[PDB]
Design a protein around this ligand. Sequence first.
Ligand SMILES: CCNC(=O)Nc1nc2cc(-c3cncnc3)c(OC[C@@H]3CCOC3)nc2s1
Length: 198
Amino acid sequence: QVLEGLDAVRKRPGMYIGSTDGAGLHHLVWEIVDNAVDEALSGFGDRIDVTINKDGSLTVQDHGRGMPTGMHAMGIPTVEVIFTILHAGGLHGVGSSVVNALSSWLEVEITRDGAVYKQRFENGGKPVTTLKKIGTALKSKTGTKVTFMPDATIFSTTDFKYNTISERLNESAFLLKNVTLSLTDKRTDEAIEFHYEN
Ligand SMILES: CCNC(=O)Nc1nc2cc(-c3cncnc3)c(OC[C@@H]3CCOC3)nc2s1
């Protein structure tokens, strides 16, 4: 297993997301959604909320365990390793890092153990903060939130399509069972929820 930096993805995006058109743009959504879905599949979290923000960024929030908030080597947060090393609930191999590489900015927010942490990356996944404790929450509160702005210098289109996302989340709700998937478009105010009882 040869590990790579985020430059590798930016130089050959087609290798990781297939294309740099709308199909590729939406593959970024699929990667982050799929990480939330994997976490719910393992029994952690019963809702996954997706928001297309007015500024064109996209948020996915889960109520799973929260990505680990500790250190890897050399005082580097485990979260930073997930989002910045390409191994070409989990996590990676290779999703979070590919999305970060192809975003002009990305924020991850983790809630667990009574604490709220945040890390921000810019310009193709360069950390501009460490994993910072930003606040507190009840001990019962857990989850991972990822918001990213796709890189307009990579993609031919940076316009997320509500109907495309809605269909994928409907499908994911049907496969998962007993988990609510929601979509809210802040550009147009549209919203929908999916939940299949089993
Ligand atoms: C909004 C997108 N949603 C998400 O990415 N959800 C995720 N939820 C988890 C939970 C764990 C998690 C927590 N506690 C205990 N075990 C795993 C995890 O672990 C990553 C591990 C360290 C490196 O790879 C294995 N990743 C994720 S991504």
